[PDB]
Amino acid sequence: MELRKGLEDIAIKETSITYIDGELGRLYYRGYSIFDLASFSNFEEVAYLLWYGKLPTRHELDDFKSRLAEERSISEDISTFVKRTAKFGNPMDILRTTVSMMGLEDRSEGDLIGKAIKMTAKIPTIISLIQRTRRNQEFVEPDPSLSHSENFLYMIRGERPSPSDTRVLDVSLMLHMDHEMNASTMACLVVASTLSDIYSSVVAGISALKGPLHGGANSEALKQFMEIETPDNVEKYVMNKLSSGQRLMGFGHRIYKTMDPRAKILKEYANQLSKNEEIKRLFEIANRVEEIGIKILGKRGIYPNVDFYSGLVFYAMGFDPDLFPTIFASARVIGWTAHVDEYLKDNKLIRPKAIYVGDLGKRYVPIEERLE
Amino acid sequence: MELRKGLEDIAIKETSITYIDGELGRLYYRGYSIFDLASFSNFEEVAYLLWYGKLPTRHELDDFKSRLAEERSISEDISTFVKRTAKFGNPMDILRTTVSMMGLEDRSEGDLIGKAIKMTAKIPTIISLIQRTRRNQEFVEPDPSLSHSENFLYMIRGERPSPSDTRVLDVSLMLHMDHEMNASTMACLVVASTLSDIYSSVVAGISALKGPLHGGANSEALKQFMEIETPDNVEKYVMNKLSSGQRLMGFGHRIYKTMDPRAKILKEYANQLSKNEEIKRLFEIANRVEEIGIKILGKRGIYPNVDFYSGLVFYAMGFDPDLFPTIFASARVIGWTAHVDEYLKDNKLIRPKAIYVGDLGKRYVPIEERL
Ligand SMILES: O=C([O-])CC(=O)C(=O)O
Ligand SMILES: O=C([O-])CC(=O)C(=O)O
């Protein structure tokens, strides 16, 4: 029988959650254009749409925003664990462990969406505590009067952010909430398919998202912009990379044959950030890298993906680069839990096989008869 | 493209680790019959075989046994977490968390098999601490002079086991070390395919193994023997279960269309367990349920699986029934990590598709216009 390794040409579910148009560079959440959501929506409204399948009324959104805000606090045992590990732990290992501890401590049955709301609310608190602890700063408690993105920036900086900063983060999070099928969604679904709990599913999603191949989930492009150091070095660096058969970071995608619509929106909204000398210089480098990259690689359907600008935007708003994968998980958890919820409406155990290519019927020999 | 919901009969890798013959009821690890390994081998020698692909020499096995014995200790952070949660937490949630903590505490690069050795050595220390804490008993530290299975029972009981009890645990663990492809192996491989670390892979395996649909990692057959209560009540209990649309627990397999060879080996080795009155009774019940269940369900290719006897065997050696899935994982981590190691020799990112059946091109309706 045929080996289908990678599963690239196999669908494992029907979905109404996300639609990717790789041809035209379009992305839809439940039929709504990502462009319109970036323009007019906000984190809580899109989270509501992804989980409940419709845009909320004024009343539904006010109640929903309150629910999220009163779930933001974390248990003292989780908070102590983060404080203890923040300086030396891989932050994805910290986040993986704390979501595992959340599930251990929540024994209550069913309520998949209630549990997803709890993880979504608490992950920014955990990330903020890692960042603060790393800088020898005291924990800033969540403020239940602030909206999700506003509160996120408050917990990192210890001061209420400008509405323009809130908007850029709010948009960046909306852009990472779902992207249909990929290794991390597949890990959540394989675990859900056994009727394991939703915390187990998310822990598996975080385990997969951590890997460097996952796509989208890194700060390599930003590292590259820092290596280049000056705008005038862009050409020398990019040519010496490509000619040397090396890769331009933040370029390429398995689906978009064009500019990633998420990269396009991040580049536009990145203009609202006030930039010191360092950030101004890094954005000038990124824009030149973008131009020469598209000139050489665009022919072959190799274009900026979301991670070309995402790392630099998060860095610009005051996040350490090695937290970027955790910030990705804080958004994508909505997509993961939405996909599990949809799958479980008609559950099927995911139970593939393997092709055997070894030996059979070998004769067991005791250890005294094994030579050398 | 093709919708293959459940990936039934989709092959996702090539393997030389494990072969299952569902028609004849046979199983092989690296070409060796499970019957021969159960007759003549031991936990460390089979772990060596699964990881390194051949039977070790005396020198290779002495070194490997040391490497395993030297890694059994757990961090103060892990032992304190286990002690805090042993009486309250789901034991698979505790294991999931403590393997996650192992990963966090090990920031070394590469050495997949070294990290597999660390997880395989430490998991029994965690299981034993859960069990001891539940019984208001003091932690028993691993003894590096004892073999894996000897140590395991020592950490549970606080006294060195008999060689007969050691052999039964040794065989029972070997029988769970690998079973080719299933949801837990698949969860491990999906995570490994991104080049995430081997602890991340195993955390995902444990997360999948916890689910009641996984197969093999449950105590439902033992619970059913305990509900039956007397050997005389077997015919009536089973006939009334099967006539009311319910299942005989520990019967049925997606692959074996005969007696699971792991069930046949556990039944034979269970004879060497010295049994108190309860365990004698439960085994009499189990042997009658087997006889009866084969009579009724056999013609339909429904036979005992490994989990018909496994829960009862682990219970008879002094483990609480609800630790059984952790014990399953303590052996199966060898298979998982061996499968990951094999896969990564020619890695391919696992990135399936979905069929979109939803709405497209909807107008964003401003909130003041909604219902
Ligand atoms: O889906 C992918 O290929 C990876 C990705 O871009 C994402 O997770 O957003
Ligand atoms: O493989 C399966 O189908 C379940 C099982 O029996 C095992 O994992 O040992």
Numbering used by the authors:
A (entry chain A): 1 to 372
B (entry chain B): 1 to 371
The article reads:
Citrate synthase of M. sedula (MsCS) catalyzes the first step of the incomplete TCA/glyoxylate cycle in this strain. CSs (EC 2.3.3.1) catalyze conversion of oxaloacetate and acetyl-CoA into citrate and coenzyme A and are well-conserved enzymes in most organisms. The findings reveal that the protein functions as a dimer, similar to other Type-I CSs. The monomeric structure of MsCS consists of seventeen α-helices (α1-α17) and four β-strands (β1-β2), with distinct large domain and small domains.
